[PDB]
Enzyme design. Structure first.
Site, PDB file in Angstrom:
ATOM      1  CG  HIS A 172     -38.464 -90.953 -47.017  1.00  0.00           C
ATOM      2  ND1 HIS A 172     -39.289 -91.865 -47.641  1.00  0.00           N
ATOM      3  CD2 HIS A 172     -37.216 -91.481 -47.062  1.00  0.00           C
ATOM      4  CE1 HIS A 172     -38.573 -92.902 -48.043  1.00  0.00           C
ATOM      5  NE2 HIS A 172     -37.311 -92.696 -47.698  1.00  0.00           N
ATOM      6  N   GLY A 196     -41.171 -98.400 -53.502  1.00  0.00           N
ATOM      7  CA  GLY A 196     -41.750 -99.244 -52.481  1.00  0.00           C
ATOM      8  C   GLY A 196     -40.761-100.053 -51.635  1.00  0.00           C
ATOM      9  CB  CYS A 206     -37.981 -96.724 -48.756  1.00  0.00           C
ATOM     10  SG  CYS A 206     -37.085 -95.882 -50.065  1.00  0.00           S
TER      11      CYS A 206
END
Ligand SMILES: *[C@@H](CC(=O)OCC)[C@H](C[C@@H]1CCNC1=O)NC(=O)[C@H](Cc1ccccc1)NC(=O)[C@@H](Cc1ccc(F)cc1)NC(=O)CCOCC#C
Ligand SMILES: *[C@@H](CC(=O)OCC)[C@H](C[C@@H]1CCNC1=O)NC(=O)[C@H](Cc1ccccc1)NC(=O)[C@@H](Cc1ccc(F)cc1)NC(=O)CCOCC#C
Lengths: 304, 304
Positions: B41, B143, B145
């Site tokens: 993503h 932030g 991920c």
């Protein structure tokens, strides 16, 4: 969101850990540039434990009596000295993994990370507080002496603790990296006791702010109190007194939540006097006092 | 002695963390040999969230749409593909710090360390468990991920988790490093919900043994039980059933303490029914279930 017992990344410190052997005795040392720091009781035996004559023990030892291994490879000792309760072994090789560092002495109630090591090899990393009685509630076994505690401020590792011993109550004691003990302890095997421990009030408040930031707010009401009225309640539950300096450092958490510090004090007074009513806060059924205000800001804002 | 929520040393993993930017979206990647792994993503935008057409988004992009940075040095991207929910970016240089590693898929109840990172820079390390409902109770901000979970099997890093999202209940979900989610979740911003969570029985029993090894014994009783009778009590309190394999995995802790597993089961049964009546266990007022039997052995025996 979320809130965990979080340590600093240990990489910078992992590359500094060595094992130091003198005779039958092996423990851990910290290799910074061309010097290895370790507890001086590496040169002792149990014949020496009550009244070790460290200067005699060391002068009988020579550079070749010390075996320092990094990973599994030997470094050559070319000089030795003692600074308070720490031995300083000068080695022939500078550590290319030495981080930018400072030796610091932390204050009671402050936290640090602990890289637990055995025979020069890291086992794990956890977060500890320096208790008001200058012990730490660590996890250490035989062989862990020389393990260090540290904080990371910017890109500098601030080393604040070297491990020396366990008291019979199960708590731990040690020095700063200049060899001076925290608290009223000595590196002789005399019967030693810590004063009665107290709860670190400012950290409890910090953790209650962490709970609000994470949505656990059931204990919050539109209550408030005064500093003096809170402290009369705190001493009844052996909480350390809250000073206006403590209030000021909770400023950042109060700023982000909109809950004034003395309002959170009113909430904490109510928890001490009424209990938690079977509830949990951040997964805990006890009030937690080993997160400082900075710890909370750091992981509720992602400082790297 | 002592017992702490202890994470693995994170140094080997710190050397693998990079920043990955696609457009204005920036998250963390894992750089191993000449491949960088990160959540797919990263290639999305707001409108895509409901039902991202990832194959379309990915095929439309050029290698130049991907900015990978290791510290302050760019890694040029020379290929971009997808495996399930992870993007694989082929880069021009292999990571000189690539450790010995495997990609493993862990089972519910197993623990792992998490290196929380932002903009490719490590912030902290903590210990998590894969809950029975295939979520984790982590600590992650926007932030984070691409942060990874891992165990260390001596010198081999076993990567088992990469972080993708937070469910509205405050818990976290992600994939293994082959890109497959744990649990029934998908990387679409749709109403998703974890099944009922349950307590990890074998872990609570492991933690009771850790308590005994550290001298908390007040909760021990003389009774023994059977696995069948104990499992009836477990079901009542939404505890996972205990298998004979769990019993046997607890054997090293029974061997160290001399307390049979089924005797410790009878102690837990009384704790579940009547609680702790004001007492604490290892400084907790709740039954802790995020220490596996091996976690306990590693701390109550000193494995490095
Ligand atoms: C590190 C020594 C090492 O690694 O080198 C030897 C190969 C250990 C760390 C502890 C072992 C158990 N838990 C620990 O944290 N340190 C010791 O073994 C020290 C040596 C010592 C240091 C300073 C002054 C005298 C001796 N000894 C202890 O920790 C012992 C003895 C002691 C009690 C009280 C006190 F104020 C000083 C020394 N502690 C105990 O035996 C209490 C029982 O719990 C420990 C166990 C098992
Ligand atoms: C990591 C993404 C990142 O680093 O992007 C760089 C710009 C974050 C990690 C979370 C941020 C909040 N808590 C975290 O753990 N991931 C997200 O922001 C994902 C993006 C996404 C991934 C897969 C599918 C759709 C979107 N979104 C969320 O985590 C949102 C939306 C969501 C809810 C439930 C579900 F099953 C999938 C996605 N989650 C929330 O808004 C609820 C938590 O609110 C806290 C905040 C902010």
């Amino acid at each position: 969101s979320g809130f965990r017992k979080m340590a600093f990344p240990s990489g910078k410190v992992e590359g500094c850990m060595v094992q130091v052997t003198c005779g039958t005795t092996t423990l851990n040392g910290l290799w910074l540039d061309d010097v290895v720091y370790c507890p001086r009781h590496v040169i002792c035996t149990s014949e020496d434990m009550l009244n070790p004559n460290y200067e005699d023990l060391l002068i009988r030892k020579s550079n070749h009596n010390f075996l320092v291994q990094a990973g599994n490879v030997q470094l050559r000792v070319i000089g030795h000295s003692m600074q308070n309760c720490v031995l300083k072994l000068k080695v022939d090789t500078a550590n290319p993994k030495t981080p930018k560092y400072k030796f610091v002495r932390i204050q009671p109630g402050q936290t640090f990370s602990v890289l637990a090591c055995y025979n020069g090899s890291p086992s794990g990393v956890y977060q500890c507080a320096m208790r008001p009685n200058f012990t730490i509630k660590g996890s250490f076994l035989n062989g862990s002496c020389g393990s260090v505690g540290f904080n990371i401020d910017y890109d500098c590792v601030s080393f604040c603790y070297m491990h020396h011993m366990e008291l019979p109550t199960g708590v731990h004691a040690g020095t700063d990296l200049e060899g001076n003990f925290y608290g009223p302890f000595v590196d002789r095997q005399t019967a030693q006791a810590a004063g009665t421990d107290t709860t670190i009030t400012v950290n409890v408040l910090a953790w209650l702010y962490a709970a609000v930031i994470n949505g656990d707010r059931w204990f919050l009401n539109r209550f408030t109190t005064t500093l003096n009225d809170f402290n009369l309640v705190a001493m009844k539950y052996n909480y350390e007194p809250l000073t206006q300096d403590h209030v000021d450092i909770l400023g950042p958490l109060s700023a982000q939540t909109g809950i004034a510090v003395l309002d959170m004090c009113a909430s904490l007074k109510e928890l001490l006097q009424n209990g938690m009513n079977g509830r949990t806060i951040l997964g805990s059924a006890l009030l937690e006092d080993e997160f400082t205000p900075f710890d909370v800001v750091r992981q509720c804002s992602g400082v790297t």
